[PDB]
């Protein structure tokens, strides 16, 4: 007779997790735009520079 001791375990688990969260955020934005423009017509030519 093999003197071996064996065991089986069954387990059930039901978990209810109720969670809260909150947040704030603060953003600060700098921006530097550029522009150049060359217009041309039959007899009218222009140019423009912007920032």
């Amino acid at each position: 007779s093999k003197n071996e001791d064996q065991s089986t375990q069954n387990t059930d688990s039901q978990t209810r997790t109720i969670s809260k969260n909150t947040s704030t955020s603060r953003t600060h934005t700098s921006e530097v735009h550029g522009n150049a423009e060359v217009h041309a017509s039959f007899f009218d030519i222009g140019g423009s520079v912007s920032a």
Binding site: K2, Q9, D12, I18
Partner: protein, 52 residues
Amino acid sequence: GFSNSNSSTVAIDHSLSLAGERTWAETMGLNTADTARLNANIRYVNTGTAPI
């Protein structure tokens, strides 16, 4: 057009959590060498002629 830009977002959070749990468990242990125990129900019969 040539547009540069630069932002900076500063944030903060608080949080709660309420976790309720109910756990059921069952276990059956056994030893293969000692599975069962015996018990006999027996009588004694004298069919002879002298008592013992």
